[PDB]
Write a protein that binds this ligand. Structure first.
Ligand SMILES: Nc1ncnc2c1ncn2[C@@H]1O[C@H](CSCC[C@H](N)C(=O)O)[C@@H](O)[C@H]1O
Ligand SMILES: O=S(=O)(NCCC(F)(F)F)c1ccc2c(c1)CN[C@@H](CF)C2
Length: 261
């Protein structure tokens, strides 16, 4: 409830500005964190080993880039978040309403990276078409989505970016939160986890969030303890010019894990 309390001042547009607009949001530099995250996602799905019918995005927040390469492998996509404000923001983009955040640059780069000759409008069209619902969620609950969630369970795959560490006060919480979401994933399923490395706080407007600083090994061990087979775990070290005053993140990790059940 302590963290949950802090997230009450969370400003969606301040978050988007701090992390998805320049300099961090500049996709032109191939050395940026942006191109790196999109490549990890694209390369993974390009292996063709992450497929199914349903997929759930945990703690989607007000962003969609994490689903750009995934949307063409899953016909039923469910997005989620603890904050009403974030679900509202996602709606504005999915419905193409006024003031929606502009993700066209990311769509274009996903198309560029994937290399299938696809135009970005068709990519955004496909994603919007496959996202069937935006549901509330709380990874701190043994049943994240709840009792009678409209989401098809178990899911064939899960995607989660910058959520778990951002909502857990310490390692143990991180672990449980991971066990909580893992129940949502069908045995043999896949989990694509992205997150901040060794970060302790980040700003989102008037909100100042505490973060549990984790390391690559701690993430690996946590995934194993939860019953996953780590297929891939990479690290991106945050360059100096991407070190702004919005947080103290040291790097970013990408984990492709398979629930071995
Ligand atoms: N208990 C909880 N369970 C699930 N999500 C939570 C949560 N508490 C906070 N969150 C959400 O977790 C998000 C962390 S920011 C990450 C946003 C997005 N996934 C990205 O890649 O940028 C926020 O949207 C916040 O509202
Ligand atoms: O800089 S990033 O690695 N990616 C943004 C740049 C982009 F969009 F181009 F990929 C990033 C994204 C989100 C967050 C961070 C970094 C670090 N703070 C967390 C707190 F939860 C949120």
């Amino acid at each position: 409830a302590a963290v949950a309390s802090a997230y009450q001042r969370f400003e969606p547009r301040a978050y988007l500005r701090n992390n998805y607009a320049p300099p961090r949001g500049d996709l032109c530099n191939p050395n940026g964190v942006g191109p790196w995250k999109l490549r990890c996602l694209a390369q993974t799905f390009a292996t063709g080993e992450v497929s199914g019918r349903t997929l759930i995005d945990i703690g989607s927040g007000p962003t969609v880039y994490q689903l750009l390469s995934a949307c063409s492998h899953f016909e039923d996509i469910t997005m989620t978040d603890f904050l009403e404000v974030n679900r509202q923001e996602l709606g504005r983009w999915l419905q193409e309403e006024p003031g929606a955040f502009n993700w066209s640059m990311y769509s274009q780069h996903a198309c560029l990276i994937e290399g299938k000759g696809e135009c970005w409008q068709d990519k955004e069209r496909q994603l919007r078409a496959r996202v069937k619902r935006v549901l509330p969620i709380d990874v701190h609950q043994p049943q994240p989505l709840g009792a009678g969630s409209p989401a098809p369970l178990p899911a064939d795959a899960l995607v989660s970016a910058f959520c778990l560490e951002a909502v857990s006060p310490d390692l143990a919480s991180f672990q449980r939160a991971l066990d909580h979401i893992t129940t949502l994933l069908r045995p043999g399923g896949h989990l694509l986890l992205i997150g901040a490395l060794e970060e302790s706080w980040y700003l989102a407007g008037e909100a100042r969030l505490t973060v549990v600083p984790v390391s690559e090994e701690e993430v690996r061990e946590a995934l194993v303890r939860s019953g996953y087979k780590v297929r891939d775990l990479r690290t991106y070290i945050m360059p100096a010019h991407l070190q702004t005053g919005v947080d103290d993140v040291k790097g970013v990790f990408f984990a492709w894990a398979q629930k071995v059940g």
